[PDB]
Amino acid sequence: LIEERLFPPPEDIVKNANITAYMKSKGFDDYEAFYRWSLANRFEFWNDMAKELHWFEPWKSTFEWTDKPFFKWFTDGKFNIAYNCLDRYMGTPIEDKVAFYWEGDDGSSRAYTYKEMYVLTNRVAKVLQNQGVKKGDRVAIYMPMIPEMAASVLACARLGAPHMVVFGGFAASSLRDRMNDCDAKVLITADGGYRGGKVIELKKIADEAVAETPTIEKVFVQRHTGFEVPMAEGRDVYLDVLLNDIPEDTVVPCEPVDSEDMLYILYTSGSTGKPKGVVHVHGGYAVGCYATTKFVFDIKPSDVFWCTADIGWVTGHSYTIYGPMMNAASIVLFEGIPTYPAADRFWSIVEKYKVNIIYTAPTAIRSLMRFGEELPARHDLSSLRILGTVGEPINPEAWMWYRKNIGHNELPIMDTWWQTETGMILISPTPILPLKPGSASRPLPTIEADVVNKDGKPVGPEHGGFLIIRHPWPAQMRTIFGDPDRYKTYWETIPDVYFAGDAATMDKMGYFRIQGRVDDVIKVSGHRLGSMEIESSLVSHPAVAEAAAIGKPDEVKGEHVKVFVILRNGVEPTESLAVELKRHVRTLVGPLATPDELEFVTSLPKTRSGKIMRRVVRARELGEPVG
Amino acid sequence: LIEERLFPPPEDIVKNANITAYMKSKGFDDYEAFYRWSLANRFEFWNDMAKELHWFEPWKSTFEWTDKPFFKWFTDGKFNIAYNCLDRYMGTPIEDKVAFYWEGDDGSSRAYTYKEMYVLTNRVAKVLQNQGVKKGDRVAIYMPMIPEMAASVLACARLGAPHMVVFGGFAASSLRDRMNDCDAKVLITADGGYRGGKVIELKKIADEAVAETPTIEKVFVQRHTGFEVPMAEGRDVYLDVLLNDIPEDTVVPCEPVDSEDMLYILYTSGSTGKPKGVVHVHGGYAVGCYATTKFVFDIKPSDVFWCTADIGWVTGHSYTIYGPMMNAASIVLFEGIPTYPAADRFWSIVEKYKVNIIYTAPTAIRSLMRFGEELPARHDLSSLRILGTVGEPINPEAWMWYRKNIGHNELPIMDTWWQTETGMILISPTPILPLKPGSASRPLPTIEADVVNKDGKPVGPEHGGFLIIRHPWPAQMRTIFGDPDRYKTYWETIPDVYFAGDAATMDKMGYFRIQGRVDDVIKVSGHRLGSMEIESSLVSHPAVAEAAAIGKPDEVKGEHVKVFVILRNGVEPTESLAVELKRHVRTLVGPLATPDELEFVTSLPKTRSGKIMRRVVRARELGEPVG
Amino acid sequence: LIEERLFPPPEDIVKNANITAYMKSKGFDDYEAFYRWSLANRFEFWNDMAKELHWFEPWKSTFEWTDKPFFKWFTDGKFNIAYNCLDRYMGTPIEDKVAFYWEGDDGSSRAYTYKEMYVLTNRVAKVLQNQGVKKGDRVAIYMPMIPEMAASVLACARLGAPHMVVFGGFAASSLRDRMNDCDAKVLITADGGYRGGKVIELKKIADEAVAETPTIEKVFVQRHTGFEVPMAEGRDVYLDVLLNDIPEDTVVPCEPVDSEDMLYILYTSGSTGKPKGVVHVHGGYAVGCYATTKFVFDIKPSDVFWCTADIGWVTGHSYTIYGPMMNAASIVLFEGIPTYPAADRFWSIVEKYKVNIIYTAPTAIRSLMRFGEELPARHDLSSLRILGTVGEPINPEAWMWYRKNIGHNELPIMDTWWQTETGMILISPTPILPLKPGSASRPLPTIEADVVNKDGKPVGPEHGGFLIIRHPWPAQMRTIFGDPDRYKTYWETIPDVYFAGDAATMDKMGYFRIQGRVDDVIKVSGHRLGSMEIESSLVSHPAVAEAAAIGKPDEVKGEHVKVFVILRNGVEPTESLAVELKRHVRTLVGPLATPDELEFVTSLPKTRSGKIMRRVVRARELGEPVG
Ligand SMILES: CC(=O)OP(=O)(O)OC[C@H]1O[C@@H](n2cnc3c(N)ncnc32)[C@H](O)[C@@H]1O
Ligand SMILES: CC(=O)OP(=O)(O)OC[C@H]1O[C@@H](n2cnc3c(N)ncnc32)[C@H](O)[C@@H]1O
Ligand SMILES: CC(=O)OP(=O)(O)OC[C@H]1O[C@@H](n2cnc3c(N)ncnc32)[C@H](O)[C@@H]1O
Ligand SMILES: [Mg+2]
Ligand SMILES: [Mg+2]
Ligand SMILES: [Mg+2]
C-alpha cells in the first residue's frame, strides 16, 4: 500500500529550485523530457556545469576513452579542487560567510568563516610542505570530526598530495593495512577523539599501526583531548607546536594539477580479503560533486547544510567537504553521536544552527524512532526545507516517521543511491519530483541507469535484475590503486556497462528501487563490510581453521554479521572462546566489524576450487527465494 | 481472504421471498436470467409495480424524455403518495395494525395504528390548510424523531405542499440557508428534542434562523419537552393549542396531484459552497420506494421493520416513512441514540418490539463493536430475519461482527448502495442472492449499472473505474431546485449516462464494490458533507483568509475532517484560536460538520483560475495511489 | 514469503544417502532425470527393490491387471513379510542388534533384540495356533503400545492370519463394529494401558464390545497394568498363563503365502456412515514400505529410528513395524503422550536413545510450541540427522520451529504425503532435495502424480485442482473388505486414474502442496474422521432426529468438529443435553471423535434425494471461497 503512494512536492520549492532554473535555460519545464535531452547532450550538460567552476587552464575535450575501459574528463584542463572550495571566495563577501559550524561531542562549538579556513589550510599546507610532502605523495589521515580534519584534507588537495582518510572507528590492523597498501609517507592524527563523553585513543592505535608501516616518516598530532599520550622523539610531533612558527599571513598557492591527477584514495570492502583503494581525481570529481549538490539539495546562499556522515566515508568526502564548499554553503560539522548526551541531540543541532538541509542515514533514523515522537517535538525544526537519506534502503515506516516528525508531513526526502566507486549521487529525487516511499526515484541528468539480466537484456517494468549504468559520468573512480584488474571487472562483468553489484527494480513510471547487494558485501549500521575480509580477521587467530561470514536481517542495524567458524581439531568450543574471538576482531579490525553472532561448525560448503560457497551457508540458515 | 467468500442464504427465505414470487409469475427461477429480462422489459416491470398502488387516474406512458436529460414516469397519472400510506388502508383490517412504534430517548413509548396516523395527519393537514398552506408551497420541518414528524410529512404530502426537512443536528445558519433557498412559507418545529438524556434547543435555534428567513409567515411548535421557550406573538404558535379546535373526525381529502408534482426537497452537500435541493416527485418515487422495500427487505404482513436512520436524511424519507408504509409494515420510530442509557439500547429495542428487519449504518455498528459481544448477547434477538446496512463501506470485520452477534451466523445482510439523488436503492442483495462481505452485490431489476473510464468505455472485471447507470429509474430526482444546470451535470459528465461520483469495481460474478467518492464529498459518521461548504463556514470568520478541507480515514467515524486554514496576516496562530474556529463552525453549521483537526498554513495550492486543488492538499498529507 | 524459500540439504547427507547410491548404480546424479527414468522403467525399479528381500519362490510378472481396476504385483511369488522382519536376520550379527527400545508411560523401559522378538513372536504364534488360528482367519488386536503388540502383529503375519488393529482410543461401539464387519475370530487385548499416568480400561471396553460380537471365540489378555479385571471363564484367558507352557525354543515356521494374500485390514473413515476396511497384502506392501523407508529416511546400520504414530493407524503399521524392521533399524516404541510427565518428554526420549530419525505429526509440534523453546533446549538432540512430519499440512511457522529447535537450523524435514489406502509414502522429499516449508516436494520414484480438473485435464502450474496418481504402485490397497464397489470409485471418479480426495497445487519446479480433503473427511488432532459417521453416532441417541457434522479450523487440533443437531419436537434444547450428547459419543465411539461444538437447529439443507448438503452448512457458517 504505502510504498505505491505518490507525494507531491511542497509549496514554493519547484518554481525556486536550481534544477528548474537550469532546465528553463535550455527550454524545458518537464523533468522527463529534460532527462531525455540530457542523455543525447551529456557533454553540453557537463560543460555547462564545469564552466561554473574556476579552471587554471581550459580543457580540450569533455570526455574520452584512453584504454577502454579507462577514460578521462576535461582532458588537459588544469585545476585544483581546493581553489574552488576556498581561494576563489577570497576578496568576495563569501570570505566572511561561515564555512564550518563545528559542534563538539560535549556541546562546545566554534564557527569558521571561509577566510579562516583559507588561512588555516594554507598554514597546515606549509607544515606538510616543510616536512617534504609534494604532489603525488600519499598522506594518511586518522582523525575525529574536527575543523583540522577538514583543513588537513584541503591542504593535501592544494598541494596535489592525495589524501587517504581512515575512519576513526577502525583499529590498528585496519589502519596499518590501508597505509601499507598505498605507501603513505606521513600520518595526520589526534591525541584522541570524543564519542559519547568517552575518549577514543587514536594516538595509541596509530602507534600500534605505525610500528608496522615502514614508509611513515612523520606523524603530526592534533592536540584535541589534551591527554598525556606517548610521543616518539623524531617521528611524532604536535601540530600546534609547528603552527606556532607558521605566520597568520602564510600562503601556499594551489598546485595547478591536471584534471586527472589523484585527489584521494578511499579503501572500500569488496569481494576479496583485502580492501580496495578507490581512486578519485580532481576535475570530474569536483564537477560531479558540485552539480549533484546544487540540484539534489538545491543549495542557495542562505542555506545551512548538514550531512551527518563521517568524513571517513565517501558520503563525508563528497557531501560534507567538497560539494557543499563548492556551492559556498555554511556546513555543520559534528564530532559526536545521535544519542549523547540524549537522543534529541540531532534536533538540538538543527535548532541551534537553523539547519535548512539534513542528509542522514536510515541507521540514525531507525535508532531515534526507538525513543518516541516526543524528542524531536521538543525542538523547533521549522528551519528545515529538505531532508535526505543515504547508504541503505529506508523502509516505509521509517520514511513516514522521518517525513512526519522531522518534515511536518511536507518536506521532500531525497533518497540518494550511489557508492564509493561512483563518487557522486547517480539515482535520486530532486525537489521537482513527486516521491514514493523507499524509492530512489529517477536517474540524475546524463545518467543512463537500467535493470538487466546476466547477459545485459532489459528485464522490463516490475521485474528484478541487476542495476547497471551505460555510460561514464565525471565523478566515477578512475582506477583501483595498484590493481587495475579489479577496476576492469566493473565494466566487464556485463558487456560494455558499469555493474553496480546491486539488485534493483524499475516500476511503470521509471522509479528505481534498490533491493541490495548481489555479492559478498554486508552493510552493518551504515558501514560497508566484506564477507571475505571478516573471515580473514578470524582466520588470523590460532584457534580458527576457517570461517564463513553472512549477513542476517536486524531491525536496528539493517544487517548484522554471523560467522560460522571451523576450529582446529581439539579446541574446546566455548562461550569464553566466542568472547575471545570477538575481542580479536574488535581490537584489530574495529567494533564496526565485530560479529554479533558466532557459531562453531565442523565443516563448510566449498566449490571444487576450495572457495567458500557463502550463498549456501546463508540459504541453509535463512532459505533462498526462488528466481 | 474473507471478502472473497460466498455465504449462501439461510433456511426458508428463498422459497418464501417476495422477489421469488414475482419472478415465478414471469417464468423465472434464476436471478441472473430474470435480471436480463428486466433490462429488456423495464416498462412492464415498473407497470406491474405501479399497478399495486392506488391511482386516482391512470397513466398514459410509463416513461418519456421531456427535454433530455429531464424525463417523467407515469405521465398524466393522478396520484398521492399519502393515500397509499394511509387512506387506502381505512375500512380494512390494516387500519388497526400498528403503523409506528414510537420509542422515546428516555424509554417512554407509544404505538400508533394506521387509523390513528390517518386521523392525526388529517388534523395536522387542517391546521396547515387554515393557515393558508396549499399545493406547491414549501413547508420546512425541523423536528426530533417523534410521531408528529411523521404526521407533518404525510400532511404536507396530502396537501400537495412539498416538505423540506432539516435534520435536527443542524444549527441556525444551516437551517436558514435551506429555508431561504426554497422560500419556505411555514416552519414546523418543537420546543426541543432529547438525545442521550439532554435537551436539544430546537426552538431557540429556529428563532436565530427565522429572524433571517423573510418568507416564514408562521412557526408551529410541538410541545415535546414542555420547557419554557420564547414565543413571538403573531408568528409562533403551539400545535396542541390549534389541534384543540380541530375535531377528531376532521377530514382533508388527498389532493390528486400529477405523478410529476413535487413531493419534497432535500438539501445535500455537493461540489459547490452551497447545498443543492434534490427534488423528488410523488409517482415514480412512490413506485420505486414501494418496489425496493418489498423485494430487498422482503416485507410480509407480520413484519416489524426498523430503519435506524434519521428522517432528516434520504434513508429516513424512503425507508422509514414512505416505502414501509406503502407495504403496510409496522415501523419502529426511535428518538434517541445507540449508547443511551447504555450501549445495548438497539438490542433492547429489537427485543421489546420483536423487530424482524433492521436497516442500520456501519457507523452504528463500528460504534457498538467497541463495547464487546456481551451487550447484544444479553438480549433475545431471535425475532430478526433480515439485516441491512447503508450509507458507507462496511469493512469485513464489521460485517462478520454484524452477522455473528446480531445475525447468529445465518441472517443475510442487505448492503444497499444508493444516494439522495437516486431516491431508492439501486445496487443491493435481495434474500435470494449469495453474499460477499463488503459487496453491494448485483443491481436491482431494470438498473443497468456499469463501471467505465472517463470516456465511457467499460473497464472490464476486476478494474477500478467510475460507477454509472445507463437508463433512468422511477424514483430518481427530477431536478435540483432553482438550479437545472446542476442536474444536467449528472447526465453530461460522461456522455448519456448517470454519473454517481463514486469509484467502483465489478468482479467476475458481477458483484459491485463501492470504494468511495471521486469528488469533494466527505462522509463523517454517516453524514454527507462537502469540502467547499466546510471551507465557506470557516472563511466567514474574521480571522480566516482561506481554507481547504480534506477527509482523513478514522476508525470510528469512517472519515474525519481536517482543514488547512490560511489566517489573515498578523493573526497569532494559537490553540485558543483553533478552539474558537471550531466553535464558530459548531454554532452556525452544526456539530456534524465540525472539523476534528485544524492546521494553520501560509499558502495553499491553486489552479490558475484561483480554485483550491484539494487533491494536492490530501496527497501532500496522505500520498496519492498511482493510476 | 517464507513458503517460497528453498533450503538446501545439510553437509554430508547427499553424498552418503541411500537414494544417491541407487541412482548412481543406474547412471544418474540428478533426481529430476532419474525420476523421469523411473516413470519409463517402473518394473525394473520395483524388481530391484523386491530382490533385496527374501522370497520363498520368485515371481513371474512384476505387475498385472486382473479385472481392471483390480491388479497384482509379483504374481505367483511366495513370501512372508514376517520372514523379512525377523527370521532372515537369525544367524547373522543383526540377531543381537536392538529391534525395539520400549519406553513406558511411567519411564520404565526395556530393549528387545531381533532374536528376542523372533522368540517372542514364535511363542505367541504357537498360542494362536493352538487355539485354532490359521491362514485367512481375522485376528482383532486392541492393545496399548507395548512389545506384545508388535509381537502379536508379526505372529499373525507369520501364520498368514490377517490382523485387524483397533486403536486403543476407540470405545466399545467402534471396536464392535470393526470386529463384526470383518468377522474376527479372536481378540488380543490387555487388562489396560497407561496414558499420562492414568489407566485406560481396555479389557472393560473389550467386554462391552465382545458381548455384541458373535464370532469372537477367544480373548487373549496381556497383563500390563496388573489390575483386577473381569475374566469370563472359557472365553477370556491371560497370555502369560498360556506362554508359561510354551517353551523358549518353540518354532512356528512362516507360512509361505502368495504375494497377494491378505496381510491386514485397517478401518478408515470415508464418505459413508460406516468405516471401510482397507485391505493390504504381503508382497507389494512389503516391497513399497521397504523402499520408501530406505530412501526417504535414509536408514543406515547405526540408526535409531522413532516414528511417534500409534500402531493403531497406518503410519504405525508401515513406518513403525514393517518398513523399519525390513531395514533392520533399531526402533523406539513409546507407550505414552508428549506432555507426561512434562512437555519435554519427546526430547528426553531422543536424548536417552540417541534417536537419529524422528517422524512425527504437526499436531504434536503445534502442541509443544505452546510450551516454549526452553524445553527442547534442556536436552541433547545432536543425535538427530533427519526429521519428518506426516498426516496433515504443517504451517510455515511450525516448520520453522521444528527446523530451528529440533533441527538446529540444518536438518531436513521429510514432509510425507500419503493415506491409509496408499500403504506407503507417495509424495515426499528425500535427503537430496532442497526443501520448501509446507511442501511435500516431488513424487517418489515411479509415482506419476498430477493435478487435474474434474474431467482429468492438467490445470498447469500454480492452479488448484484434484490430486491424482496415474499408475498403481506396489503397496496400494487391493480392495475394501466386503465392498469392492467402494474400491472401484477410487479409480472411476476421474477416468483411469487414482483419485486421492485431496486438493493440491504444483508449483513451477514441480513441488506439490496439499490443501486438504475435497470430501466429508475431517482430521482432528491427526485422526481421520468421517462427517457421516459422526452424524450416525448422534442420530443413535433418542433425543436427536438428524445431524450435520462439519470441520472448523482450530489452532491446536487442526480442525475441530461442530455438529448441527435437529432434536425431536418437544425436546428442551439445553446445556445439559449438549453435555449428554457429547458423553453419548465419547462413551460409544471414543474421545477422538467427540464434537467440541454442538448447535441445535430446526432444519438442515437437503438434496431432493434427502441427503445432507454439508458444504452448504459449512458455507453458511464460514463462507465458501469462489472457484
Ligand atoms: C554512498 C554509499 O553508501 O556508499 P558505499 O558505502 O560504498 O555503499 C554502496 C552500497 O550501498 C547501498 N545503497 C546506497 N545508497 C542506497 C540507497 N539510497 N538505497 C538503497 N541502497 C543503497 C547499495 O547496496 C550500494 O551498492
Ligand atoms: C443513501 C445515502 O447514503 O445517501 P447520501 O447521503 O446522499 O450518500 C451517498 C453516497 O454514500 C456512499 N454510499 C452509500 N451507500 C453505500 C454503500 N452501501 N456502500 C458504499 N458506499 C455507499 C457513496 O459514496 C454514495 O455516493
Ligand atoms: C498417512 C495418513 O495420514 O493417512 P490417513 O489417516 O488415511 O489421512 C490421509 C489424508 O491426510 C492428509 N495428509 C496426509 N499427509 C499429508 C501431508 N504430508 N500434507 C498434507 N496433508 C496430508 C490428506 O488429506 C490425506 O488424504
Ligand atoms: Mg588460524
Ligand atoms: Mg474571513
Ligand atoms: Mg434418534
PDB file of N, CA and C in Angstrom, chain C residues 347 387 395 411 415 534 562 566 617:
ATOM      1  N   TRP C 347      11.810 -35.074  23.932  1.00  0.00           N
ATOM      2  CA  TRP C 347      13.206 -34.695  23.814  1.00  0.00           C
ATOM      3  C   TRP C 347      14.042 -35.500  24.808  1.00  0.00           C
ATOM      4  N   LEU C 387      14.503 -35.242  10.218  1.00  0.00           N
ATOM      5  CA  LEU C 387      13.205 -35.004  10.815  1.00  0.00           C
ATOM      6  C   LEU C 387      12.137 -35.314   9.769  1.00  0.00           C
ATOM      7  N   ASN C 395       2.028 -25.895   8.945  1.00  0.00           N
ATOM      8  CA  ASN C 395       2.020 -24.487   8.564  1.00  0.00           C
ATOM      9  C   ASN C 395       3.466 -23.992   8.674  1.00  0.00           C
ATOM     10  N   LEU C 411      18.704 -29.536   9.765  1.00  0.00           N
ATOM     11  CA  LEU C 411      18.261 -30.874   9.431  1.00  0.00           C
ATOM     12  C   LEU C 411      17.139 -30.788   8.408  1.00  0.00           C
ATOM     13  N   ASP C 415       8.468 -33.948   4.752  1.00  0.00           N
ATOM     14  CA  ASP C 415       7.023 -33.779   4.774  1.00  0.00           C
ATOM     15  C   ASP C 415       6.344 -34.778   3.814  1.00  0.00           C
ATOM     16  N   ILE C 534     -19.903 -39.505  12.198  1.00  0.00           N
ATOM     17  CA  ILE C 534     -20.128 -38.732  13.417  1.00  0.00           C
ATOM     18  C   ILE C 534     -21.629 -38.497  13.592  1.00  0.00           C
ATOM     19  N   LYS C 562     -17.799 -29.456  14.607  1.00  0.00           N
ATOM     20  CA  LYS C 562     -19.037 -28.883  15.066  1.00  0.00           C
ATOM     21  C   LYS C 562     -20.182 -29.644  14.420  1.00  0.00           C
ATOM     22  N   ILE C 566     -30.662 -31.581  14.788  1.00  0.00           N
ATOM     23  CA  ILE C 566     -32.099 -31.381  14.883  1.00  0.00           C
ATOM     24  C   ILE C 566     -32.631 -32.353  15.925  1.00  0.00           C
ATOM     25  N   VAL C 617     -23.839 -26.221   4.802  1.00  0.00           N
ATOM     26  CA  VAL C 617     -23.850 -25.987   6.237  1.00  0.00           C
ATOM     27  C   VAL C 617     -22.606 -25.187   6.591  1.00  0.00           C
TER      28      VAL C 617
END
